[PDB]
RNA sequence: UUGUGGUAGACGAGCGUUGUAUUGGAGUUGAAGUCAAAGCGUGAGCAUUGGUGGAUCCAAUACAAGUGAGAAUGCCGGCA
RNA sequence: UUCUCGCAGUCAGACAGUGGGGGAUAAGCUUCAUUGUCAAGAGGGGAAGAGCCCAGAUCAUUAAAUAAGGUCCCCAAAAUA
RNA sequence: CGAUAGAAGAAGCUGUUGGAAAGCAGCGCGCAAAAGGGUGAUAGCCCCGUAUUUGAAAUUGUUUUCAUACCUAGCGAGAUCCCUGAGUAGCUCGGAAAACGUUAUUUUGAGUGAAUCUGCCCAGACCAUUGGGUAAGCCUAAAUACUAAUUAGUGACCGAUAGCGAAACAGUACCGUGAGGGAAAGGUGAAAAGAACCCAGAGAUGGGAGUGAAAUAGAUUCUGAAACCAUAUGCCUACAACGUGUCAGAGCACAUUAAUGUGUGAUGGCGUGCGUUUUGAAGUAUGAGCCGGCGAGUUAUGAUAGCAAGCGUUAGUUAACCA
């Protein structure tokens, strides 16, 4: 593709321009309707307006939240189905970077989730074991140590 | 497509040098090269094109018109896009940049494909360090070498990896030559030149990135 | 970057005034009037295309009936002598053209008599 | 271009969207419901598809 | 086979167009451009020739469009 | 025509027939439903004639059948009892 | 090390179109400069020049190195010794900021008002444990915006109804007392070689004879279109109610963007303008004198969707910053 013969693969779809004639598409009609508020100058009104209709968001109670001023601490989770094609006995923080698992700035405790059994003998360390996950890793002839 | 080394005179030698596999690709793709030259060709702007809009033109707003007892329009403003006051709502800005970006893997695929195409285009004869030496500062000998093989079809872009005083003195006063560095490349330059020269060593160096 | 092209408008004006010809007063001299008169001329052409068929059909009917009344027959009666007898593909315009041929309509009227 | 806090305080979001709203007759008056109506109007509810995009794209 | 009426509207086919870079060319032994003709186009257009002007533009793939004028009781300018 | 999706246009309607409500079977009148018209779609006809009748126009044609309907002249069309 | 004067600094001829060359053709030649422009069309080698290359009399600045004031500076033993930045911290009526709408935290307009090192305050009210440090004294280079201002340079920067109101003797003339508002601008011709001689005409002015390569190169000015005002060539052309029209067309004049040719039109048929916004206009609803110039759907941060592409099983992807 040289500048005298350069061609794309499949591109150059139709573009929109309305101020260049009627027969060229959407002339003075412009597709903006007729005799309207949004049709006039400074149309495209802000979100959160219905044209005088009574909205429901202020006519509806608010959901419950028993945690105000506090946030749920993030925890790293090694999904059993995803960890099926991974192998590292005695998981430690300083090695999951190579496997694109853990983050550089992280102190998140590990949590084990999932009954989807894996396919290798692996010994694993986690702060929490789920009972179904515990059974699944028991069927995987491996071992698991409960951390903090 | 083995390439034979050439001398400073234009005659070939007894060693057809094997081509490193770090340039030959598997499938040819026209879209990555297209958007690479798209992003590279642009950005000639220097903020030069700038206009004053209706809120940017200088003037003291006033109403010399009175709507009643007059024939012309009310038009309480005088600096309009359709009057002599001036100021168009649409025009060039010194802040537009038209952001474009290219990924890493797509860039690697595009560079490998264009290296395959340019190496197999057979518009090149391999050069070595031996002809780099014994080189005069004259651009006349460079033209003698160029016209000995008469590369008069397209502009020729040499790729170099080491710097020599003869290189900086010469290859500077000819309309049909250009020189760049191994990593100082862009697919726009390759497709624009359509003719190039390559040294022996850079094949192995480029093999690494593949 | 400012776009040129202050001449293409005049090129279009000249092209469209080339369509107009033979206009009286400021109708072949004003381009705004020229556009409207070209549109009306094209519509008149369309009208002629839709009209001349019926116009000439009635013209042939009248011109042929003018001859037919001289022989003592009306157009309505004249069609019957060809509808059931003297099976032909002759046309009303064809009969009108044959009127221009002397002593040939006589052949036709003695043919239906036979 | 923000997330409308004043409007998002009245709904919940689940997997693959599925915005969830509450049930009325809970704030100022409800001496007008049956035990069936009281327990089912304490439960949750869904929304309509008439404004589905216009609420999903906004919130 | 339906066809081919069509407002708003959805929608397809595109063109002209200025500048960018090639790719090239033409060019006081003629150029952009003016005027005309009794041409080529479904169209957004293209012309050829002649006068006219005595120095610049075009042709084909792409690029971005201050881009394409019927009126805006439009403004400017000239003429009424 | 049913499902999703993007973009929507109307959002101040008028007209014919009927059943109407209102009015006063006075209203090409206001307001409801229905068969159609338009707003969205030309033409032919009747004195001119958008909404009455016949209706549904890719185009060229100086071909055929003809639709309602008409046939003394304008203008195409015939007479007999 | 610069800046405010400088300087060295490669390379072409012949014929031709030609009024003139620079263009073309033949052979070249240099190149560290075939960067850019002018040079009587359309020049790498004709110049301006340039790359490269060095220079400061005198002044100023950026630092480097050297000699060199000034002061800069911890570890052990005691001691309920002293000190550790008082209207201080606080408390009340409240503001101001803090994302805050007075609430952690800071300050005070009006008041009261301690303490010590085991002290205080704080850890978005508050106490207790735990933990921080001991304000209420003071200067502080570092990254800071902008170019009014300068150099060097650049432009998918506007090009004379554009670019700055102002290419120009622009904020100018001028208007309003006055604050304020606020026009008009380019290009002769290669070199004026700027129209000498004569004629008419009072003069002005014009026209012939000239120069000038070209006098569509004559001062009006690079060229020089339509509206507008006349003119003559072919025809129609003063009893006919025409958005001056359409289709045919006698008859006449022609002879081509050379073609079943063009031009006019005695005459027969046909024959309620346009954008607008409305239930809907021929519209007597508005608006338009014409011509020409100009004249109004965008950018930034993004998201979503369609399409396309990369990668795609432990994915993709970098922001900033840096070469």
Curated annotation (Swiss-Prot), chain A:
Annotated GO biological process: translation
Pfam short name (any one): Ribosomal_L27A
GO cellular component: cytosolic large ribosomal subunit
Renumbered residue ranges of the record's region Disordered: 1-56
Compositionally biased intervals (Gly residues): 20-34
GO molecular function: rRNA binding; structural constituent of ribosome
Domain of life: Bacteria
Keyword line: Ribonucleoprotein, Ribosomal protein, RNA-binding, rRNA-binding
UniProt biased composition (Basic residues): 8-19
HAMAP family in UniProt: Ribosomal_uL15
Primary role: Binds to the 23S rRNA.
Family, as annotated: Belongs to the universal ribosomal protein uL15 family.
Subunit structure: Part of the 50S ribosomal subunit.
NCBIfam families linked to this entry: rplO_bact (TIGR01071)
Name of this chain's protein: Large ribosomal subunit protein uL15
Gene (UniProt): rplO
Swiss-Prot record, chain B:
Pfam families in alphabetical order: Ribosomal_L4
Domain of life, source organism: Bacteria
Transmembrane segments: none
Keywords: Antibiotic resistance, Ribonucleoprotein, Ribosomal protein, RNA-binding, rRNA-binding
Biological process, per Gene Ontology: response to antibiotic; translation
Cellular component terms (Gene Ontology): ribonucleoprotein complex; ribosome
Family: Belongs to the universal ribosomal protein uL4 family.
Function: One of the primary rRNA binding proteins, this protein initially binds near the 5'-end of the 23S rRNA. It is important during the early stages of 50S assembly. It makes multiple contacts with different domains of the 23S rRNA in the assembled 50S subunit and ribosome.
Annotated protein name in UniProt: Large ribosomal subunit protein uL4
Lineage: Bacteria, Bacillati, Mycoplasmatota, Mycoplasmoidales, Mycoplasmoidaceae
Annotated gene: rplD
Swiss-Prot record, chain C:
Record keywords, A-Z: Ribonucleoprotein, Ribosomal protein, RNA-binding, rRNA-binding
InterPro entries per record: Ribosomal_bL20 (IPR005813), RIBOSOMAL_L20_CS (IPR049946), Ribosomal_protein_bL20_C (IPR035566)
GO biological process assignments: ribosomal large subunit assembly; translation
GO CC annotation, single: ribonucleoprotein complex
Gene Ontology terms for molecular function: rRNA binding; structural constituent of ribosome
Free-text function comment from the UniProt entry: Binds directly to 23S ribosomal RNA and is necessary for the in vitro assembly process of the 50S ribosomal subunit. It is not involved in the protein synthesizing functions of that subunit.
Recorded family membership: Belongs to the bacterial ribosomal protein bL20 family.
Protein name: Large ribosomal subunit protein bL20
From Swiss-Prot, chain D:
Signal peptide limits: none
Region (Disordered): 1-22, 30-49
GO biological process: translation
One Pfam family matching this protein: Ribosomal_L35p
Keyword Ribosomal protein attributed: yes
Recorded GO CC terms: cytosolic large ribosomal subunit
Keywords in alphabetical order: Ribonucleoprotein, Ribosomal protein
InterPro entries linked: Ribosomal_bL35 (IPR001706), Ribosomal_bL35-like (IPR021137), Ribosomal_bL35_CS (IPR018265), Ribosomal_bL35_sf (IPR037229)
A single GO molecular function term of this UniProt record: structural constituent of ribosome
Comp. bias regions, Basic residues: 30-43
Source organism, top-level taxon: Bacteria
Family note: Belongs to the bacterial ribosomal protein bL35 family.
HAMAP family: Ribosomal_bL35
Protein name per its UniProtKB record: Large ribosomal subunit protein bL35
UniProt source species: Mycoplasma pneumoniae (strain ATCC 29342 / M129 / Subtype 1)
């Amino acid at each position: 593709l040289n500048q005298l013969k350069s061609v794309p693969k499949a591109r150059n779809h139709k573009t929109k321009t309305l101020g260049r004639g009627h027969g060229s598409g959407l002339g003075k009609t412009s597709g903006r309707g007729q005799k309207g508020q949004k049709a006039r100058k400074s149309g495209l009104t802000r979100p959160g307006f219905e044209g005088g209709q009574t909205p429901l968001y202020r006519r509806l109670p608010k959901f419950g939240n028993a945690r105000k001023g506090f946030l749920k601490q993030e925890w790293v989770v090694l999904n059993l189905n995803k960890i099926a094609k991974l192998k590292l006995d005695k998981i430690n923080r300083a090695s999951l970077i190579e496997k694109q698992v853990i983050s550089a700035k992280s102190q998140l405790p590990i949590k084990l989730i999932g009954h989807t059994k894996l396919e290798k003998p692996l010994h694993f360390e986690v702060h929490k074991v789920s009972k179904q996950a515990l059974k699944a890793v028991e069927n995987a002839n491996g071992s698991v140590k409960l951390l903090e | 497509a083995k390439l034979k080394l050439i001398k400073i005179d234009g005659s070939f030698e007894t060693e057809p040098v094997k081509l490193s596999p770090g340039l030959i690709a598997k499938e040819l793709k026209q879209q990555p090269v297209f958007d690479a030259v798209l992003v590279e060709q642009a950005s000639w702007r220097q903020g030069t094109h700038s206009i004053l809009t209706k809120g940017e033109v200088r003037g003291g707003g006033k109403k010399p018109y009175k709507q009643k007892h007059t024939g012309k329009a009310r038009q309480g403003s005088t600096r309009n896009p359709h009057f002599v006051g001036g100021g168009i709502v649409f025009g060039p800005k010194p802040n537009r940049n038209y952001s474009l970006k290219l990924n890493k893997k797509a860039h690697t695929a595009a560079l490998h494909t264009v290296w395959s195409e340019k190496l197999a285009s057979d518009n090149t004869h391999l050069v070595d360090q031996n002809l780099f030496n014994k080189t005069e500062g004259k651009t006349k000998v460079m033209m003698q070498f160029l016209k000995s093989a008469k590369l008069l079809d397209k502009n020729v872009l040499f790729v170099v990896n080491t710097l020599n005083t003869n290189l900086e003195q010469s290859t500077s006063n000819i309309k049909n030559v250009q020189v760049k560095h191994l990593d100082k490349v862009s697919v726009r330059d390759l497709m624009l030149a359509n003719a190039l020269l390559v040294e022996k060593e850079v094949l192995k160096a480029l093999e690494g990135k593949f | 970057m400012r776009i040129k092209g202050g001449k293409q408008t005049r090129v279009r004006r000249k092209k469209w005034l080339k369509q107009a010809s033979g206009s009286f007063g400021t109708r072949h001299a004003s381009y705004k009037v020229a556009k409207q008169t070209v549109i009306q001329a094209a519509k008149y052409a369309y009208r002629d295309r839709r009209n001349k068929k019926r116009d000439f059909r009635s013209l042939w009917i009248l011109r042929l009936n003018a001859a037919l009344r001289e022989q003592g027959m009306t157009y309505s009666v004249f069609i019957n002598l060809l509808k059931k007898h003297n099976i032909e593909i002759n046309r009303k315009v064809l009969s009108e053209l044959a009127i221009k041929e002397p002593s040939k309509f006589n052949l036709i009227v003695q043919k239906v008599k036979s | 271009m923000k997330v409308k806090s004043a409007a998002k305080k009245r709904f919940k979001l689940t997997k693959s969207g599925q915005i969830k709203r509450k049930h009325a007759y809970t704030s100022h008056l409800a001496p007008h419901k049956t035990t069936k109506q009281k327990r089912h109007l304490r439960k949750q509810g869904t929304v309509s598809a008439s404004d589905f995009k216009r609420i999903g794209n906004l919130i």
